[PDB]
Short mmCIF file of all heavy atoms in Angstrom, two decimals:
data_model
loop_
_atom_site.label_atom_id
_atom_site.label_comp_id
_atom_site.label_asym_id
_atom_site.label_seq_id
_atom_site.Cartn_x
_atom_site.Cartn_y
_atom_site.Cartn_z
N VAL A 390 102.81 196.76 10.88
CA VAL A 390 102.17 197.68 10.01
C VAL A 390 100.86 198.39 10.56
O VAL A 390 100.78 199.60 10.55
CB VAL A 390 101.92 197.12 8.61
CG1 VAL A 390 101.01 197.99 7.79
CG2 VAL A 390 103.22 196.81 7.85
N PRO A 391 99.91 197.64 11.02
CA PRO A 391 98.70 198.26 11.47
C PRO A 391 98.97 199.12 12.74
O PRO A 391 98.26 200.11 13.04
CB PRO A 391 97.75 197.11 11.89
CG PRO A 391 98.62 195.89 11.87
CD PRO A 391 99.74 196.11 10.90
N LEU A 392 100.05 198.81 13.59
CA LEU A 392 100.32 199.62 14.68
C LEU A 392 100.95 201.03 14.25
O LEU A 392 100.50 202.07 14.65
CB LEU A 392 101.35 199.01 15.67
CG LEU A 392 100.61 197.90 16.52
CD1 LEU A 392 101.52 197.02 17.34
CD2 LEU A 392 99.44 198.46 17.47
N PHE A 393 101.96 200.97 13.28
CA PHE A 393 102.48 202.15 12.75
C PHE A 393 101.41 203.10 12.08
O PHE A 393 101.31 204.26 12.37
CB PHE A 393 103.56 201.83 11.65
CG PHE A 393 104.97 201.72 12.17
CD1 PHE A 393 105.71 200.50 12.17
CD2 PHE A 393 105.53 202.84 12.76
CE1 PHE A 393 107.00 200.57 12.63
CE2 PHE A 393 106.79 202.84 13.20
CZ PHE A 393 107.58 201.67 13.18
N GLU A 394 100.51 202.49 11.38
CA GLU A 394 99.49 203.27 10.60
C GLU A 394 98.43 203.74 11.61
O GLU A 394 97.96 204.87 11.51
CB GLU A 394 98.83 202.43 9.46
CG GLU A 394 99.94 202.11 8.42
CD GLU A 394 99.42 201.50 7.23
OE1 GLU A 394 98.19 201.17 7.14
OE2 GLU A 394 100.16 201.33 6.24
N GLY A 395 98.10 202.99 12.61
CA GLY A 395 97.11 203.32 13.60
C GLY A 395 97.60 204.48 14.37
O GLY A 395 96.80 205.43 14.72
N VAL A 396 98.93 204.55 14.76
CA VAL A 396 99.47 205.73 15.45
C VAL A 396 99.76 206.87 14.60
O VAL A 396 99.39 208.03 14.92
CB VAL A 396 100.86 205.31 16.14
CG1 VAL A 396 101.43 206.53 16.84
CG2 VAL A 396 100.56 204.20 17.22
N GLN A 397 100.42 206.71 13.40
CA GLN A 397 100.84 207.87 12.69
C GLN A 397 99.92 208.24 11.41
O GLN A 397 99.94 209.45 10.96
CB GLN A 397 102.33 207.72 12.16
CG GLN A 397 103.17 207.61 13.33
CD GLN A 397 104.66 207.47 12.92
OE1 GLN A 397 105.20 208.24 12.04
NE2 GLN A 397 105.38 206.48 13.50
N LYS A 398 99.31 207.33 10.77
CA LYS A 398 98.52 207.58 9.60
C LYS A 398 97.05 207.91 9.89
O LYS A 398 96.57 208.98 9.76
CB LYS A 398 98.55 206.42 8.62
CG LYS A 398 98.15 206.84 7.26
CD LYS A 398 98.10 205.60 6.28
CE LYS A 398 97.58 205.93 4.84
NZ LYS A 398 97.50 204.60 4.04
N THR A 399 96.32 206.84 10.41
CA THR A 399 94.96 207.07 10.66
C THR A 399 94.68 207.77 11.99
O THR A 399 93.55 208.31 12.24
CB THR A 399 94.15 205.82 10.68
OG1 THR A 399 94.66 204.96 11.64
CG2 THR A 399 94.21 205.20 9.23
N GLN A 400 95.65 207.65 12.92
CA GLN A 400 95.54 208.17 14.35
C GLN A 400 94.30 207.58 14.93
O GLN A 400 93.56 208.35 15.57
CB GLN A 400 95.54 209.75 14.46
CG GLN A 400 96.92 210.27 14.24
CD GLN A 400 96.91 211.83 14.24
OE1 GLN A 400 95.86 212.39 14.38
NE2 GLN A 400 98.07 212.37 14.19
N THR A 401 94.11 206.36 14.86
CA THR A 401 92.95 205.63 15.45
C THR A 401 93.46 204.93 16.73
O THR A 401 92.64 204.36 17.37
CB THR A 401 92.40 204.69 14.46
OG1 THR A 401 93.47 203.94 13.86
CG2 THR A 401 91.58 205.43 13.46
N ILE A 402 94.73 204.94 17.04
CA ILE A 402 95.29 204.42 18.31
C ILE A 402 95.47 205.46 19.35
O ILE A 402 96.36 206.22 19.22
CB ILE A 402 96.51 203.57 18.08
CG1 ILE A 402 96.20 202.34 17.20
CG2 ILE A 402 97.10 203.13 19.38
CD1 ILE A 402 97.41 201.49 16.97
N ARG A 403 94.66 205.44 20.39
CA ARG A 403 94.69 206.44 21.39
C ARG A 403 94.70 205.88 22.81
O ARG A 403 94.73 206.58 23.80
CB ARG A 403 93.44 207.33 21.28
CG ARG A 403 93.28 207.81 19.80
CD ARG A 403 92.36 209.00 19.70
NE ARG A 403 91.58 208.79 18.39
CZ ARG A 403 90.64 207.95 18.29
NH1 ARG A 403 90.23 207.16 19.33
NH2 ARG A 403 90.05 207.82 17.12
N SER A 404 94.46 204.53 22.93
CA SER A 404 94.39 203.90 24.21
C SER A 404 94.89 202.47 24.20
O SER A 404 95.04 202.06 22.99
CB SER A 404 92.93 203.95 24.70
OG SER A 404 92.12 203.03 23.94
N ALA A 405 95.12 201.88 25.23
CA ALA A 405 95.55 200.46 25.21
C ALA A 405 94.49 199.57 24.55
O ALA A 405 94.81 198.56 23.91
CB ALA A 405 95.82 199.97 26.64
N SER A 406 93.16 199.87 24.65
CA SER A 406 92.15 199.15 24.03
C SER A 406 92.27 199.21 22.56
O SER A 406 92.08 198.16 21.83
CB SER A 406 90.79 199.58 24.60
OG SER A 406 89.63 198.90 23.87
N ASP A 407 92.63 200.42 21.99
CA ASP A 407 92.82 200.52 20.63
C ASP A 407 93.94 199.72 20.13
O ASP A 407 93.92 199.16 19.07
CB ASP A 407 93.02 201.97 20.20
CG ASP A 407 91.82 202.81 20.51
OD1 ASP A 407 90.66 202.31 20.63
OD2 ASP A 407 92.01 204.07 20.62
N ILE A 408 95.08 199.62 20.88
CA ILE A 408 96.24 198.73 20.55
C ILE A 408 95.74 197.31 20.50
O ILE A 408 96.00 196.56 19.48
CB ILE A 408 97.32 198.79 21.56
CG1 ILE A 408 97.85 200.24 21.59
CG2 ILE A 408 98.46 197.79 21.22
CD1 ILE A 408 98.88 200.49 22.75
N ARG A 409 95.00 196.89 21.53
CA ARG A 409 94.35 195.50 21.57
C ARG A 409 93.54 195.29 20.28
O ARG A 409 93.65 194.16 19.76
CB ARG A 409 93.58 195.40 22.83
CG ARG A 409 92.92 194.16 23.03
CD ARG A 409 92.15 194.04 24.36
NE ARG A 409 91.61 192.67 24.59
CZ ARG A 409 90.39 192.28 24.12
NH1 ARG A 409 89.76 193.05 23.28
NH2 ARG A 409 89.97 191.07 24.32
N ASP A 410 92.81 196.21 19.85
CA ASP A 410 91.87 196.02 18.62
C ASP A 410 92.73 195.61 17.43
O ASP A 410 92.27 194.74 16.64
CB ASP A 410 91.12 197.32 18.31
CG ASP A 410 89.98 197.62 19.24
OD1 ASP A 410 89.52 196.65 20.00
OD2 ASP A 410 89.45 198.77 19.30
N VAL A 411 93.88 196.26 17.24
CA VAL A 411 94.77 195.87 16.18
C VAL A 411 95.19 194.39 16.20
O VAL A 411 95.24 193.69 15.19
CB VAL A 411 96.10 196.76 16.28
CG1 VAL A 411 97.17 196.26 15.38
CG2 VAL A 411 95.76 198.21 15.89
N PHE A 412 95.50 193.90 17.36
CA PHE A 412 95.80 192.49 17.52
C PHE A 412 94.56 191.51 17.17
O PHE A 412 94.72 190.56 16.56
CB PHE A 412 96.45 192.12 18.91
CG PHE A 412 97.79 192.62 19.20
CD1 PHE A 412 98.12 193.94 19.44
CD2 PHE A 412 98.83 191.67 19.39
CE1 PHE A 412 99.42 194.31 19.60
CE2 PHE A 412 100.16 192.08 19.70
CZ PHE A 412 100.43 193.42 19.77
N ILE A 413 93.47 192.00 17.70
CA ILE A 413 92.20 191.19 17.46
C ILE A 413 91.94 191.14 15.92
O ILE A 413 91.63 190.05 15.40
CB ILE A 413 91.02 191.89 18.18
CG1 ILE A 413 91.21 191.93 19.67
CG2 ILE A 413 89.74 191.07 17.85
CD1 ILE A 413 91.29 190.63 20.34
N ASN A 414 92.06 192.28 15.27
CA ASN A 414 91.85 192.33 13.91
C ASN A 414 92.77 191.58 13.09
O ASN A 414 92.58 191.05 12.01
CB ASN A 414 91.76 193.78 13.36
CG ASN A 414 91.44 193.93 12.04
OD1 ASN A 414 90.22 193.56 11.56
ND2 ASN A 414 92.23 194.71 11.21
N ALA A 415 94.02 191.40 13.65
CA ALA A 415 95.05 190.59 12.99
C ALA A 415 94.95 189.13 13.35
O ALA A 415 95.68 188.28 12.85
CB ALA A 415 96.44 191.05 13.44
N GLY A 416 93.85 188.73 14.10
CA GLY A 416 93.54 187.41 14.31
C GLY A 416 93.98 186.70 15.60
O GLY A 416 93.89 185.46 15.77
N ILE A 417 94.66 187.52 16.40
CA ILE A 417 95.07 186.93 17.76
C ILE A 417 93.84 187.02 18.61
O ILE A 417 93.13 188.01 18.59
CB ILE A 417 96.17 187.84 18.33
CG1 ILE A 417 97.50 187.63 17.57
CG2 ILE A 417 96.39 187.51 19.88
CD1 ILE A 417 97.69 188.59 16.39
N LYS A 418 93.61 185.96 19.37
CA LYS A 418 92.42 185.85 20.12
C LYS A 418 92.39 186.65 21.42
O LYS A 418 93.47 186.76 22.03
CB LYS A 418 92.08 184.45 20.45
CG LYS A 418 91.70 183.52 19.36
CD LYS A 418 91.77 182.02 19.79
CE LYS A 418 91.44 181.10 18.66
NZ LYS A 418 91.81 179.71 18.91
N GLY A 419 91.32 187.29 21.71
CA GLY A 419 91.21 188.15 22.86
C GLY A 419 91.81 187.53 24.07
O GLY A 419 92.68 188.14 24.77
N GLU A 420 91.23 186.41 24.35
CA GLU A 420 91.73 185.52 25.49
C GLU A 420 93.27 185.39 25.48
O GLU A 420 93.90 185.52 26.47
CB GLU A 420 90.97 184.30 25.38
CG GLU A 420 90.66 183.83 23.95
CD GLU A 420 89.42 184.51 23.28
OE1 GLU A 420 88.43 184.62 24.01
OE2 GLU A 420 89.53 184.90 22.08
#
């Protein structure tokens, strides 16, 4: 859901780092 909305709704996903942010915010550890 956050990937879909990041790409098509909020358009806040523009780079690999932004994709990574979605995972971090979902609780997957950076490492």
Side-chain angles (χ1 to χ4, degrees):
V390 166
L392 285 169
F393 266 119
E394 298 191 351
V396 179
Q397 295 184 50
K398 196 187 177 181
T399 60
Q400 285 178 357
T401 46
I402 293 177
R403 310 197 217 76
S404 67
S406 175
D407 297 338
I408 300 173
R409 179 175 186 278
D410 286 346
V411 167
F412 284 71
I413 301 296
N414 187 57
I417 292 85
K418 290 164 179 166
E420 34 280 315

